[PDB]
Design a protein around this nucleic acid. Sequence first.
DNA 1: GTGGTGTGTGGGTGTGTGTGT
DNA 2: ACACACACACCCACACACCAC
Lengths: 557, 587
Amino acid sequence: IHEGILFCIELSETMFKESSDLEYKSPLLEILESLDELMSQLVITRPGTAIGCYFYYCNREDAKEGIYELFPLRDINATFMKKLNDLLEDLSSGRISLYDYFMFQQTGSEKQVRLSVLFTFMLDTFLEEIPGQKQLSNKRVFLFTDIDKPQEAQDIDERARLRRLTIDLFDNKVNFATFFIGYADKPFDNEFYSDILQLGSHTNENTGLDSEFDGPSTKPIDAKYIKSRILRKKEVKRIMFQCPLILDEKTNFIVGVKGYTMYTHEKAGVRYKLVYEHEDIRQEAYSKRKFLNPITGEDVTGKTVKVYPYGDLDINLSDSQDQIVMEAYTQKDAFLKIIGFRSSSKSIHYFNNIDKSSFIVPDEAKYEGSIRTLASLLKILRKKDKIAILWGKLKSNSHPSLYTLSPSSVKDYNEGFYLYRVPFLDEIRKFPSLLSYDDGSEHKLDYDNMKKVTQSIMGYFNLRDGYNPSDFKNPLLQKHYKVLHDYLLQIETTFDENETPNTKKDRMMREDDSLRKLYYIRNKILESEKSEDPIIQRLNKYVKIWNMFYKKFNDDN
Amino acid sequence: SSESTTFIVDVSPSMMKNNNVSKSMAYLEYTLLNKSKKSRKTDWISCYLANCPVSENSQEIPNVFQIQSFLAPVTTTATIGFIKRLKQYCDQHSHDSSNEGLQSMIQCLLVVSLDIKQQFQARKILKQIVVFTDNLDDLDITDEEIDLLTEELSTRIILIDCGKDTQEERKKSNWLKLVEAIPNSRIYNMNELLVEITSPATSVVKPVRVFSGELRLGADILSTQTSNPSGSMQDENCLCIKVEAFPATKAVSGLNRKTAVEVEDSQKKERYVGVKSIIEYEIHNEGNKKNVSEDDQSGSSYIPVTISKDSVTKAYRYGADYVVLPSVLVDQTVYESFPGLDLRGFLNREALPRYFLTSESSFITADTRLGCQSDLMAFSALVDVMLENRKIAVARYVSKKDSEVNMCALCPVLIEHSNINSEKKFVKSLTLCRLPFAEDERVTDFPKLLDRTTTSGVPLKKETDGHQIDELMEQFVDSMDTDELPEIPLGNYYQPIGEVTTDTTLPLPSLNKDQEENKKDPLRIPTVFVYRQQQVLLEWIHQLMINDSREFEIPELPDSLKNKISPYTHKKFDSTKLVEVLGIKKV
DNA sequence: GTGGTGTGTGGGTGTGTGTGT
DNA sequence: ACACACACACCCACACACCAC
């Protein structure tokens, strides 16, 4: 529900050093830019997330014995985003440099921070209770480090103390997300941090069960992936449903299943608050909203009943009868039952989508053997082009429905199942009644020529990568939060009355991400009409030829 | 429009003995109760009882009795009363007062015809006659009265034979000669009607049009995104096709309920009146008091005060700040959009992951009310090439001016129309389904399943063997395989709305020979909750309101509907191994 | 001699549910 | 001890048909 992230960035001599592969971006600058972008994205998608950013070891005067905070562990607000953006702007304009800003100079391996006080500070920051925000439900530490072998690496007892500190932190539900930086010229040897961040060694009996968690993945990451590793870790997975999957109920073959939402639908003004303002005092307001019939006037809440209308007849079904009515086709609690299996082509279509897909993973915390059984099911359903038809409801207070459960492909990173909803016969609508049908039924030659021209146009406009959601920000969301951001930071608005034709397209391509792609498509046609090459010049004539075949029928009479 | 159906049910002892009058009563109850829920003001109902032993009529015509006059709108109370009155009349003269000698039931039609003329006369409302009979060959019709009936009546005759006695040889006359006489006439068997009323009655919704504009590839954003004629109609190098959009799949909500309050009425009918929906805004003002107590008294304690919505303003949330914008900035907060379908590019179906599609589908089709033949030909060619190359287009779609801009996938689809010509025609269209934006992406990292490791990435060797469980699951999935069931071909998945329109709303078992074997796809099933609720309501009305039973005996779900929501069986296979290894014992 | 009903259909908006640790 | 996202009621418009004050 409420999440907190603690960026802890370790400064080093190579840290400020720019990289040629990173195209004149220092790793520290890359981390700051990624943090600012992440905060901007989280203010839209998942607000009410606490983020703190700390640097060490800083000889800067404002410090805590070497732990300088860019900003404390507070919920995302416009002031910290502006503070980060001002620093980034100073860095870009050349007014200040990262060496100067952190008061860090190449003076022969300046003092390094002791990891003991570092982890003590990490525990203290989460253990503190800032009055402004409620307690964090989830706690994470994003550890950026370029020094794989500190002073504590050569010791043994200090390693034990550090491991004890790591265990103490982990006991407080603080999960490390390591961002160890490894370059091609200097690999990151993670043995020290792999030893420190794990839970040590522990034995229960000779063949007893062991701990299910081994600590953070101390696998180092390359610098070019730093930003890619941050934005893809800003959000935890939120469970949408947790239901038993019933494979065979006669032999009691039932496992557990967790389901998350892969892609939501974000709308602009969903997050708001009704505020009543009187003179100079602003307060929040509530919106009840109670249903009372003015003819009676008596108390309604808690005294109304729901009755089925069948015309002028009202049917007041008793609960003991309504429950038996419902039990004929569904169970009381949320459930899914495997009804059958069939080929993937016979059930998976792109024209029959009605709902949002969901992601399903095993749940072994309730039904033992869920994970091993679902792994085998995933193997088998993936072996053949097969899915599983499921009947049931993902929530207790939800309608039963048919779903298709498909094994997730080996191309994507996640392992699991994808649950789509199958549209009912009522949900499938009827194709409209057209006023004409004389497309190409008696014009086979001309229809075939236009088919060839349209195919020729379509051939070159193929999307190579495919659709990427991250390449398309929501224009309404971007504009809404841009207005909020500029009002909070007091920034003068654009769109003066002196606009120019080039200014219009420049504004359009910045307010919208798809309009930039459309301008590229238009500019490709504009460039093709001018290219002297006999090959590049084709994309014009094709389109040109098409505009004839349209006009061949559009303006005949 | 406006229709009128008249029921003429034979009550001759031949009908009664084989229980055909009861079947007629049940079908009448079903159709009248289905008419009652819509309660259309232009749907007339009338019922006549024919071949009765005795009858009371103002017209002094014997053996014909009008149980129900011309009624509209038909209400549930009226239907319940009519069915109970029919039961009373049938039980009154069931066997004790049987008549002597056969009577001309066909003559009973003629008088009814006059009433059909008398009620409507000049108005052009549709008129039909529904007649239930046991035998067709036993009735005699005068040759000279056939022409009189044909000239007098302009109503379609619908004859339902309630008899189930037919030999291997087939011979038809009498009524059939009347059926050929009056156009749009037809004959049915009572078993087909009884089957049709028990099947789930799917709804048919007339398409509206949700969008009208242009599908454009390569247009310039300067002319298509300005407060001017905002199409590509003014083009010299780009693709513009006039296009309109209709719903394709839309999530149906179940049969709703009325939040109502019981009234204390002297008539003792248990009446419920629906509540009103009035919205109020209230705020909680704090209050300061000093009371002696050991507790801090930090419980909820405020004074609520209701103020109108004109003094309440919306505060938008940015991070941890709830800000109220001025009017000008709120006006600037809306994104200025313009309707259109701007194509970006074409990708394969498999290059687009299935979970990307996150909204209800919509038909995109060439606009024929504002477009021309050019739009139709261009759109058909586009859909044809997309279908041939298995392409799915990505597009920027806006439906209204001040409406949200979406990304969408266009899938080339074709719908089969029978058409007046013998050859069927596949009408071409696109199917549009929304794609996620950047803020819609929620993909995170989940622990592996097949080669699952620890959190740090240390592999965890699961169990001691991977042959038994895998083989068990493979045989289990083969046991419940539903590939022997066919799949409906691509082309009949979406059905034209014209092919599902009939000249009347009377429940009849479909005039299409291609509707046979329409129930063999496991995925295409009727709304089970909707039909279940409708069946329960119909049975509650039937048992308590008319039959006057004493306890609602809940009907079981029909086997045809139950089969599609119950586990299948391709081949038998035993998975008892899990329980056998676990062990069942009372601890 | 051309506007009023009436319905159907889609879209909008509080509310009471629901994830666990 | 707490954020999203359904299903659930009722409430608002627009299009198109019929029919005429």
